[PDB]
Coordinates of C-alpha atoms and ligand atoms in Angstrom, one line a residue:
Chain T
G204 CA 134.5 108.0 83.5
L205 CA 134.1 104.4 84.6
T206 CA 137.2 102.7 85.9
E207 CA 138.1 99.6 83.6
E208 CA 136.9 97.4 86.5
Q209 CA 133.5 98.5 86.4
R210 CA 133.6 98.5 82.8
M211 CA 134.4 94.9 82.5
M212 CA 131.7 94.8 85.2
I213 CA 128.1 96.2 83.0
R214 CA 130.0 93.8 80.1
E215 CA 129.4 90.9 81.9
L216 CA 126.3 91.5 83.5
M217 CA 125.2 93.2 80.0
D218 CA 126.4 89.8 78.7
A219 CA 124.8 87.5 80.8
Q220 CA 121.5 89.5 80.6
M221 CA 122.3 89.0 76.5
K222 CA 122.4 85.5 77.0
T223 CA 119.4 84.8 78.9
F224 CA 116.8 87.2 78.8
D225 CA 114.2 85.4 75.6
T226 CA 112.9 88.9 74.8
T227 CA 110.4 87.3 72.7
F228 CA 109.8 85.1 74.8
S229 CA 109.9 82.5 71.4
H230 CA 110.7 79.5 73.5
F231 CA 108.6 80.1 76.2
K232 CA 105.5 76.9 75.2
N233 CA 103.7 74.3 76.3
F234 CA 102.0 76.9 79.1
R235 CA 98.3 76.3 79.9
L236 CA 95.3 78.1 79.2
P237 CA 92.1 78.7 80.4
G238 CA 89.7 76.7 80.6
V239 CA 86.8 76.6 78.1
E240 CA 89.2 79.4 106.9
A241 CA 86.3 81.1 105.1
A242 CA 88.4 84.9 106.1
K243 CA 91.3 82.9 104.2
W244 CA 89.4 82.8 101.3
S245 CA 88.5 86.2 101.5
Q246 CA 91.9 87.7 102.0
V247 CA 93.1 85.4 98.9
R248 CA 90.0 87.1 97.0
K249 CA 90.6 90.2 98.1
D250 CA 94.5 89.0 97.0
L251 CA 93.1 88.2 93.7
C252 CA 91.2 91.0 91.9
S253 CA 94.1 93.3 92.9
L254 CA 95.6 92.6 89.6
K255 CA 93.4 92.5 86.4
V256 CA 94.5 91.5 83.2
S257 CA 93.3 90.0 80.2
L258 CA 95.5 88.1 77.5
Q259 CA 96.5 88.4 74.1
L260 CA 98.1 85.4 72.4
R261 CA 99.0 86.6 68.3
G262 CA 99.4 83.1 66.3
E263 CA 102.5 82.6 64.1
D264 CA 99.8 82.7 60.9
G265 CA 98.6 85.8 62.2
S266 CA 95.9 84.3 64.1
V267 CA 94.6 86.4 67.4
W268 CA 92.8 84.4 70.7
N269 CA 91.7 86.7 74.0
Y270 CA 90.5 86.0 77.0
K271 CA 88.5 88.2 78.6
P272 CA 88.8 86.9 82.5
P273 CA 85.8 86.5 84.6
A274 CA 84.5 88.4 87.6
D275 CA 84.5 87.9 91.2
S276 CA 81.0 85.4 91.8
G277 CA 82.4 83.6 95.4
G278 CA 83.9 80.3 93.2
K279 CA 86.9 78.9 92.0
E280 CA 86.9 80.8 88.9
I281 CA 89.3 83.8 90.5
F282 CA 92.1 80.9 90.1
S283 CA 91.6 80.6 86.9
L284 CA 94.6 82.3 84.9
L285 CA 97.0 80.5 87.9
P286 CA 98.5 77.7 86.2
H287 CA 99.0 80.1 83.3
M288 CA 101.1 83.0 85.3
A289 CA 102.9 79.7 87.2
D290 CA 104.0 78.5 84.3
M291 CA 105.1 81.5 82.8
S292 CA 106.3 83.2 85.9
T293 CA 108.4 79.2 86.0
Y294 CA 109.6 80.0 82.9
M295 CA 111.2 83.5 83.7
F296 CA 112.8 81.6 86.4
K297 CA 114.6 79.8 84.5
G298 CA 115.8 83.1 82.6
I299 CA 116.4 84.4 85.5
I300 CA 118.3 81.9 87.2
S301 CA 120.8 81.9 84.0
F302 CA 121.4 84.8 84.5
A303 CA 123.2 84.9 87.8
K304 CA 124.7 81.8 86.6
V305 CA 126.3 83.6 84.2
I306 CA 128.3 86.1 86.3
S307 CA 131.6 85.3 87.7
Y308 CA 130.8 87.2 90.5
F309 CA 128.1 84.6 91.5
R310 CA 129.5 81.7 89.9
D311 CA 131.9 81.9 93.2
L312 CA 129.4 82.7 96.2
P313 CA 129.0 78.8 97.7
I314 CA 127.0 77.0 95.7
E315 CA 124.7 77.7 99.6
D316 CA 124.9 81.1 98.7
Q317 CA 123.7 80.8 95.7
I318 CA 120.7 79.1 96.2
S319 CA 119.7 81.9 98.8
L320 CA 120.6 84.5 96.6
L321 CA 118.1 83.2 93.9
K322 CA 115.3 82.4 96.4
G323 CA 115.9 85.5 98.3
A324 CA 116.0 87.3 94.6
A325 CA 114.4 85.2 91.6
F326 CA 110.3 87.3 91.8
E327 CA 112.7 90.9 91.7
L328 CA 114.8 90.3 88.4
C329 CA 111.4 88.1 87.5
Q330 CA 109.8 91.9 87.5
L331 CA 112.3 93.9 86.8
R332 CA 112.8 92.0 83.7
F333 CA 108.8 92.6 82.6
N334 CA 109.5 96.8 83.4
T335 CA 111.9 96.2 80.2
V336 CA 108.5 95.1 78.2
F337 CA 106.4 97.4 79.9
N338 CA 104.2 99.4 77.7
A339 CA 103.2 102.0 79.7
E340 CA 101.1 103.9 77.5
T341 CA 98.6 100.8 77.0
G342 CA 99.3 99.0 80.0
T343 CA 100.3 96.1 78.7
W344 CA 103.5 93.4 79.4
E345 CA 104.1 92.8 75.7
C346 CA 105.6 89.2 75.6
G347 CA 106.1 88.8 72.3
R348 CA 103.0 86.7 71.0
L349 CA 102.0 86.9 74.2
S350 CA 100.6 90.2 75.7
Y351 CA 99.5 90.8 79.2
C352 CA 97.1 94.0 79.3
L353 CA 95.8 95.1 82.3
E354 CA 91.8 95.5 82.8
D355 CA 89.5 99.0 83.0
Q356 CA 94.4 105.0 88.3
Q357 CA 92.7 103.2 90.9
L358 CA 95.1 101.1 89.4
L359 CA 98.3 102.9 90.7
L360 CA 97.0 102.5 93.7
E361 CA 98.4 98.5 93.8
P362 CA 102.2 98.5 94.9
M363 CA 103.1 96.6 91.8
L364 CA 101.0 98.8 89.2
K365 CA 102.4 101.2 90.5
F366 CA 105.6 100.0 90.7
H367 CA 105.8 99.4 87.1
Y368 CA 104.6 102.7 85.9
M369 CA 107.3 104.3 88.1
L370 CA 110.3 103.0 87.5
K371 CA 108.9 102.4 83.5
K372 CA 109.1 106.3 84.1
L373 CA 113.0 106.8 84.3
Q374 CA 113.5 105.7 81.2
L375 CA 116.2 103.9 81.9
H376 CA 119.0 102.5 80.0
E377 CA 119.4 98.5 79.1
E378 CA 122.6 98.8 81.8
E379 CA 121.0 100.9 84.8
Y380 CA 118.9 97.4 84.5
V381 CA 121.0 94.8 84.5
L382 CA 122.9 96.8 87.4
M383 CA 119.8 96.9 89.6
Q384 CA 118.9 93.4 88.7
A385 CA 122.8 92.6 90.0
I386 CA 122.4 95.1 92.5
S387 CA 119.3 93.0 93.8
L388 CA 121.2 89.4 92.8
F389 CA 123.7 90.4 95.5
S390 CA 121.6 91.5 98.9
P391 CA 122.9 89.9 101.0
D392 CA 120.6 90.0 103.7
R393 CA 118.4 87.1 102.2
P394 CA 117.4 84.4 105.0
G395 CA 120.2 82.3 104.5
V396 CA 123.4 83.9 103.2
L397 CA 126.2 83.4 104.7
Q398 CA 129.5 85.3 103.1
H399 CA 127.8 88.3 104.8
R400 CA 130.7 90.8 103.6
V401 CA 131.5 89.3 100.6
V402 CA 127.9 89.5 99.2
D403 CA 127.8 92.7 100.5
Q404 CA 131.4 94.3 99.6
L405 CA 130.3 92.8 95.8
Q406 CA 126.7 95.1 96.1
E407 CA 128.9 97.9 96.7
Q408 CA 130.8 97.3 93.9
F409 CA 127.2 97.3 91.8
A410 CA 125.9 99.9 93.3
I411 CA 128.9 102.2 92.5
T412 CA 129.3 100.8 89.5
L413 CA 125.6 102.4 88.5
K414 CA 125.7 105.3 90.3
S415 CA 129.4 105.9 87.6
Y416 CA 127.3 105.1 85.1
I417 CA 124.4 107.8 86.1
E418 CA 127.3 110.7 86.3
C419 CA 129.5 109.9 83.2
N420 CA 126.2 109.7 81.0
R421 CA 123.3 111.3 82.8
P422 CA 123.6 114.9 83.0
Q423 CA 120.3 116.1 82.1
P424 CA 118.5 118.3 84.7
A425 CA 115.5 115.6 84.4
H426 CA 118.5 112.2 85.2
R427 CA 119.8 114.5 88.4
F428 CA 119.1 112.4 91.9
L429 CA 119.0 109.0 89.5
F430 CA 120.5 106.6 91.6
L431 CA 118.6 107.9 95.1
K432 CA 115.5 106.9 92.8
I433 CA 117.0 104.0 91.8
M434 CA 117.5 102.3 94.7
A435 CA 114.2 103.4 96.4
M436 CA 112.4 101.8 93.7
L437 CA 114.6 98.0 94.7
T438 CA 113.8 99.0 98.2
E439 CA 110.2 99.3 97.0
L440 CA 110.8 96.4 95.1
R441 CA 112.0 94.5 97.7
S442 CA 109.1 94.9 99.5
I443 CA 107.0 94.3 97.8
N444 CA 108.4 90.8 96.9
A445 CA 107.4 90.2 100.8
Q446 CA 104.0 91.0 99.5
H447 CA 103.5 89.0 96.5
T448 CA 105.9 86.4 97.9
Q449 CA 103.1 86.3 101.3
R450 CA 99.7 86.0 98.6
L451 CA 101.5 83.0 97.1
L452 CA 101.5 81.4 100.1
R453 CA 97.7 82.5 101.1
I454 CA 96.3 80.8 97.3
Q455 CA 98.5 78.5 97.6
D456 CA 97.8 77.2 101.5
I457 CA 93.8 77.0 99.6
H458 CA 94.8 76.5 95.9
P459 CA 97.8 74.3 95.5
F460 CA 99.2 76.3 91.5
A461 CA 103.2 76.6 92.6
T462 CA 105.3 74.8 90.1
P463 CA 107.7 72.5 91.1
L464 CA 110.6 75.2 90.5
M465 CA 108.6 78.0 92.1
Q466 CA 108.2 75.8 95.2
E467 CA 111.8 75.5 95.4
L468 CA 112.5 78.8 95.2
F469 CA 109.4 80.0 98.2
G470 CA 110.4 76.9 100.0
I471 CA 107.0 75.0 99.7
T472 CA 108.8 71.4 100.7
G473 CA 105.7 68.9 98.8
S474 CA 104.8 68.2 102.5
Chain X
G168 CA 41.1 76.2 58.4
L169 CA 43.7 73.7 59.2
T170 CA 42.6 70.6 58.5
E171 CA 42.3 67.5 61.4
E172 CA 45.5 66.2 59.5
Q173 CA 47.4 69.0 58.6
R174 CA 47.0 70.4 62.5
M175 CA 48.5 67.1 64.3
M176 CA 51.0 67.1 61.3
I177 CA 52.4 70.3 62.9
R178 CA 52.0 69.3 66.2
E179 CA 54.5 66.2 65.2
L180 CA 57.1 68.1 63.4
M181 CA 56.9 70.9 66.5
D182 CA 57.8 67.8 69.1
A183 CA 60.6 66.3 67.0
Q184 CA 61.4 69.9 66.9
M185 CA 61.4 70.9 70.6
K186 CA 62.5 67.0 71.3
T187 CA 66.0 67.6 69.1
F188 CA 67.4 71.2 68.7
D189 CA 69.2 71.7 71.1
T190 CA 68.5 75.6 71.2
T191 CA 71.4 77.0 73.1
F192 CA 73.9 74.9 71.9
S193 CA 73.9 73.2 75.9
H194 CA 75.1 69.8 74.9
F195 CA 78.4 70.6 72.8
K196 CA 81.2 70.1 74.4
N197 CA 84.4 68.6 73.2
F198 CA 84.6 70.4 70.8
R199 CA 88.1 71.5 68.9
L200 CA 89.3 74.5 69.3
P201 CA 92.1 76.0 66.9
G202 CA 95.6 75.5 67.7
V203 CA 97.1 78.2 69.8
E204 CA 97.4 69.1 42.7
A205 CA 98.0 73.2 42.7
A206 CA 95.2 73.8 41.0
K207 CA 93.4 72.2 43.6
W208 CA 94.7 74.4 45.9
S209 CA 94.3 77.3 44.2
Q210 CA 90.5 76.6 44.7
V211 CA 89.9 75.5 47.8
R212 CA 91.9 78.1 49.0
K213 CA 89.7 80.2 46.6
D214 CA 86.6 78.1 48.3
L215 CA 87.7 78.4 52.4
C216 CA 87.7 82.7 52.1
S217 CA 84.7 83.3 50.8
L218 CA 83.0 82.3 54.5
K219 CA 85.5 84.4 57.1
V220 CA 83.8 84.1 61.5
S221 CA 85.8 84.8 64.0
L222 CA 84.7 82.6 67.0
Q223 CA 83.9 83.3 70.1
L224 CA 82.8 81.4 73.2
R225 CA 81.4 82.7 76.8
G226 CA 82.5 80.4 79.7
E227 CA 79.7 79.5 82.3
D228 CA 82.1 82.0 84.8
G229 CA 81.2 84.9 82.4
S230 CA 85.1 84.9 81.1
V231 CA 85.7 85.1 77.3
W232 CA 88.1 83.5 74.6
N233 CA 88.0 85.4 71.1
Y234 CA 89.3 83.8 68.0
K235 CA 90.2 85.9 64.9
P236 CA 91.4 83.9 62.2
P237 CA 94.3 84.3 60.3
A238 CA 95.1 86.1 56.7
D239 CA 95.6 82.8 53.7
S240 CA 99.5 83.2 53.3
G241 CA 100.0 80.5 51.1
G242 CA 100.3 77.5 54.0
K243 CA 97.7 75.5 56.1
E244 CA 96.4 78.3 58.3
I245 CA 93.3 78.7 56.0
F246 CA 92.4 75.3 57.8
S247 CA 92.9 76.8 60.8
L248 CA 89.1 76.1 62.0
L249 CA 88.0 73.2 60.0
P250 CA 88.0 71.1 63.1
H251 CA 85.7 72.6 64.6
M252 CA 83.2 73.2 62.2
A253 CA 83.3 69.8 61.4
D254 CA 82.7 68.8 65.6
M255 CA 80.0 71.6 65.2
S256 CA 78.2 70.0 62.2
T257 CA 78.8 66.7 63.2
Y258 CA 76.5 68.0 66.5
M259 CA 73.9 69.9 64.4
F260 CA 73.7 66.7 62.6
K261 CA 73.7 64.4 64.9
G262 CA 70.4 66.8 66.5
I263 CA 68.9 66.5 62.4
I264 CA 69.1 62.8 62.5
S265 CA 67.5 62.5 65.6
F266 CA 65.0 65.0 64.3
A267 CA 63.9 63.4 61.4
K268 CA 64.2 59.8 64.2
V269 CA 61.0 61.2 65.7
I270 CA 58.7 61.4 62.9
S271 CA 56.0 59.0 62.0
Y272 CA 56.1 59.7 58.4
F273 CA 59.8 59.4 58.5
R274 CA 60.3 56.4 60.7
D275 CA 57.6 54.1 58.5
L276 CA 60.1 54.6 55.5
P277 CA 62.0 51.7 55.1
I278 CA 65.2 52.3 56.1
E279 CA 67.3 52.4 53.3
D280 CA 65.0 55.1 52.4
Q281 CA 65.0 56.9 55.5
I282 CA 69.4 56.8 55.3
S283 CA 68.8 57.7 52.0
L284 CA 66.7 61.3 52.8
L285 CA 69.3 61.9 55.8
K286 CA 71.9 61.8 52.8
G287 CA 70.2 63.7 50.7
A288 CA 68.7 66.7 53.1
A289 CA 70.5 66.8 56.7
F290 CA 73.1 70.4 55.7
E291 CA 70.5 71.7 54.7
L292 CA 68.2 71.3 57.8
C293 CA 71.2 72.0 59.5
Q294 CA 71.1 75.4 57.8
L295 CA 67.8 75.6 58.6
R296 CA 68.2 75.5 62.2
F297 CA 71.5 77.6 62.2
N298 CA 69.0 80.9 60.3
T299 CA 66.7 80.8 63.7
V300 CA 70.2 81.1 65.2
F301 CA 71.7 83.7 63.0
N302 CA 71.2 87.5 64.0
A303 CA 71.5 89.2 60.9
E304 CA 71.8 93.1 62.4
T305 CA 75.6 91.6 63.9
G306 CA 75.9 88.7 61.4
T307 CA 76.4 86.6 63.9
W308 CA 75.3 82.4 64.5
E309 CA 74.0 82.8 68.4
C310 CA 75.1 79.3 69.0
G311 CA 74.5 79.4 73.3
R312 CA 77.8 80.2 75.0
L313 CA 79.5 79.9 71.0
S314 CA 78.8 83.0 68.6
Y315 CA 80.3 83.2 64.7
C316 CA 80.6 86.6 64.2
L317 CA 80.8 87.6 60.2
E318 CA 83.8 89.5 59.3
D319 CA 84.1 92.7 57.5
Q320 CA 77.9 93.8 51.3
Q321 CA 80.5 91.9 48.9
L322 CA 78.8 89.1 51.8
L323 CA 75.6 88.4 49.7
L324 CA 77.5 87.5 47.0
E325 CA 78.4 84.5 48.7
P326 CA 74.8 82.3 48.2
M327 CA 74.8 80.8 51.3
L328 CA 74.6 84.0 53.3
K329 CA 72.3 85.8 51.0
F330 CA 70.6 82.7 51.6
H331 CA 70.4 83.4 55.5
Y332 CA 70.0 87.0 55.2
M333 CA 67.6 86.6 52.1
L334 CA 65.5 83.2 54.6
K335 CA 65.9 85.5 58.0
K336 CA 63.9 88.8 56.7
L337 CA 60.9 86.6 55.7
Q338 CA 60.5 86.9 59.9
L339 CA 58.6 82.9 59.3
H340 CA 57.3 80.7 62.9
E341 CA 58.9 78.4 64.2
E342 CA 56.1 76.3 62.8
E343 CA 57.1 77.1 59.2
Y344 CA 60.9 76.9 60.0
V345 CA 59.6 72.8 61.1
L346 CA 58.3 72.4 58.0
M347 CA 60.9 73.6 55.6
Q348 CA 62.2 71.3 57.6
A349 CA 60.1 68.4 56.4
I350 CA 59.4 68.9 52.7
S351 CA 63.5 69.3 52.4
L352 CA 63.9 65.9 54.6
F353 CA 61.6 64.1 52.1
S354 CA 62.8 65.2 48.4
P355 CA 61.2 62.1 46.7
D356 CA 64.4 62.8 44.3
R357 CA 67.8 62.0 46.8
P358 CA 69.7 59.9 45.1
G359 CA 69.2 56.4 45.8
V360 CA 65.7 57.2 47.4
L361 CA 63.1 53.6 46.5
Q362 CA 59.9 54.7 47.3
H363 CA 59.7 58.0 45.1
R364 CA 55.7 58.0 45.1
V365 CA 55.7 57.8 48.5
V366 CA 58.5 60.3 49.8
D367 CA 56.9 62.7 46.8
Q368 CA 53.2 62.5 48.3
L369 CA 54.3 62.7 52.0
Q370 CA 56.3 65.8 50.5
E371 CA 53.3 67.7 48.7
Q372 CA 51.5 66.9 52.0
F373 CA 53.7 68.8 53.8
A374 CA 53.9 71.5 51.0
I375 CA 50.2 72.1 51.7
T376 CA 50.3 71.9 55.0
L377 CA 52.3 75.4 54.9
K378 CA 50.7 77.0 52.6
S379 CA 47.2 76.3 54.1
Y380 CA 49.1 77.5 57.6
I381 CA 50.1 80.9 55.8
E382 CA 46.9 81.3 54.5
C383 CA 44.7 81.1 57.5
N384 CA 48.0 82.6 59.3
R385 CA 48.7 85.9 57.7
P386 CA 46.4 87.8 55.9
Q387 CA 49.3 91.1 56.1
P388 CA 50.1 92.3 51.9
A389 CA 53.6 91.7 53.6
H390 CA 53.1 88.4 53.3
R391 CA 51.9 87.5 50.1
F392 CA 53.0 85.3 48.1
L393 CA 55.0 83.4 51.4
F394 CA 54.7 80.1 50.1
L395 CA 56.2 80.9 47.4
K396 CA 59.0 83.2 48.2
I397 CA 59.5 80.0 50.9
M398 CA 59.4 77.5 48.4
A399 CA 61.8 79.4 45.9
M400 CA 64.5 79.6 49.3
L401 CA 64.3 75.8 49.5
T402 CA 64.9 75.0 46.2
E403 CA 67.9 77.9 46.6
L404 CA 69.0 75.3 49.5
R405 CA 69.3 72.5 47.3
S406 CA 71.5 74.5 45.0
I407 CA 73.9 75.8 47.4
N408 CA 73.8 71.8 49.4
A409 CA 75.4 70.9 46.5
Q410 CA 77.6 73.6 46.3
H411 CA 78.8 72.8 49.8
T412 CA 79.0 69.4 49.3
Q413 CA 81.5 69.6 46.2
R414 CA 83.4 72.2 48.8
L415 CA 83.3 69.5 51.4
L416 CA 85.0 67.5 48.8
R417 CA 87.5 69.0 47.0
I418 CA 89.0 69.7 50.7
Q419 CA 89.0 66.9 51.6
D420 CA 90.6 65.5 48.9
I421 CA 93.6 67.4 50.0
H422 CA 93.3 67.7 53.8
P423 CA 90.9 65.6 55.5
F424 CA 88.9 66.7 57.9
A425 CA 85.9 65.5 57.8
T426 CA 84.5 63.3 61.3
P427 CA 82.9 59.9 60.4
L428 CA 79.2 60.8 60.5
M429 CA 80.6 63.5 57.8
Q430 CA 82.0 60.6 55.8
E431 CA 79.1 58.9 56.4
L432 CA 76.7 61.3 55.5
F433 CA 78.6 62.6 52.0
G434 CA 79.4 59.1 51.4
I435 CA 83.0 59.3 52.5
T436 CA 83.9 55.4 52.6
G437 CA 87.5 55.2 53.9
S438 CA 88.6 53.8 51.2
Ligands
3WF116 C1 97.1 86.8 93.9 C2 97.7 87.8 93.6 C3 97.9 88.1 92.6 O1 97.7 89.3 93.1 C4 97.0 88.2 91.3 C5 98.2 86.9 91.0 C6 99.1 86.7 91.8 C7 100.3 85.4 91.4 C8 99.4 84.3 91.0 C9 101.1 84.1 90.0 C10 102.6 84.3 91.1 C11 103.6 84.1 90.7 C12 104.9 83.2 91.7 O2 106.0 82.9 90.8 C13 104.8 84.9 92.3 C14 103.7 85.0 92.3 C15 102.5 84.9 92.0 C16 101.7 85.4 92.7 C17 101.6 86.8 93.5 C18 100.2 88.0 93.6 C19 99.8 88.2 92.8 C20 99.7 89.3 92.1
3WF117 C1 85.5 75.5 51.8 C2 84.5 75.6 51.8 C3 83.8 76.1 52.4 O1 82.9 77.9 52.1 C4 84.4 77.3 54.7 C5 84.1 76.5 55.4 C6 83.4 75.4 54.6 C7 82.6 73.9 55.6 C8 83.8 73.4 56.4 C9 82.5 72.8 57.8 C10 81.7 71.8 57.3 C11 81.1 70.8 57.3 C12 79.8 70.3 56.3 O2 79.1 69.2 57.5 C13 80.0 70.5 55.5 C14 80.7 71.5 54.2 C15 81.5 72.4 54.7 C16 82.3 73.2 54.3 C17 81.2 73.9 53.3 C18 82.2 74.7 52.8 C19 82.7 75.9 53.5 C20 81.7 76.2 54.5

């Protein structure tokens, strides 16, 4: 019940996803690993401990490294995983940038709006991709040879975590995830966007395509209001983006760690 | 019931031990860690898998790294822990060399015999020190922030492992361990020793001191024949030294890894 244009639209997104989502994280390499104003530090300390993960590395040889993070003891140890997570997020951002560049509707926007949209949405698309490797049973993001496992439902109070669990429970198709990415990417109201009307019309077409996809392929009572649920999650994701952007900038202010690509995307000038 | 000379002898050994045994391994640093002719390889493969350990690193910040070694899959991965163990053994050898140098009876030997005795006994003294940090309940050598845990009584078939368990069960005093070190160190029949008679008389005095120590301080039926048990263990330790020296040289032959200090001690010339 999709139009030809809607079918072509999904095919281009799925193509873009297939070409640019390293789902096994096989090419994530050379990353850093953890070693072997007072009001600011207090807030930053709060920000950081709200998402504790251990990390597992399975070697190509069958060996396994496992890292359990330190407790907060009033020192710099709370930052131990930041270089690694900066490297992972950087790797993901590159995939997201490549994704957007492969899409015709994106390529056709002026370069200034392309940059503005990626700056506005990179984090969100990263999270959408991360959700597809999230294991809600084990509380683990399974990134190929790397695993990030949540450390021991006071966990669901954390908006990012609540987001991943709730989104996972929707049991979305690849197509629905990639349409969510498109809808997030083509948000007409990111800071600095000039072609507000063009971007708005594109977003609307992605949303219509998604709504139609769900109607054509999901007759089950469980999936009533699925389209509206997804849109609500996208709104929540935008809120989480704003929150984590401020968390990032707060850390950066007292403890610099953003990679150049991160700085570029989050507006850090280097001065 | 010890003579004054025997008491002075134990005091000098205990002093030497106290000065040169880093029991917390606090100064073991900058070590390597595992990454993130056919008949020879077959034997070497057998040699290596006969002692599997996982490794734990507790960080000063409370973080914990844990390494589980790979299975043998016909490749170079069986060597993954060798650089680390070379670094640890090297660190231990330095302590053993320092131990010997602090002892009057050793200092008074000609420099050529000093070298010959250290070459002959360094491995044995290393093992004697390692036994004092061996936890027989957990099958773990507890080396301060580093732990080496035996991987899951087919284990007791391995002579080195049988040695550590049996020696631990004797529940020796610090004094008895350090006398064992002396007896091993002053073995008159290591290759190249010139002052055979002098070294022999020294060893005999350490053994007499040990026997007297046990008689003076251990009246319990459990400790009957303790001196003879210890001497039997020293003989076994010498056998294990010969075995592991040949294992080391077999590995080295197809996969070089010995540090310069190891090469020096085990007779590798660099050519
Ligand atoms: C603070 C804080 C946190 O809640 C814990 C870790 C922080 C993330 C660290 C890495 C990272 C990378 C990005 O590209 C963007 C954001 C972040 C931080 C966001 C706030 C986090 C999750
Ligand atoms: C082979 C073999 C083994 O049984 C497994 C690991 C080998 C040790 C590796 C490091 C090391 C260092 C030394 O100074 C002396 C010997 C060794 C090797 C001995 C044989 C071992 C235990």
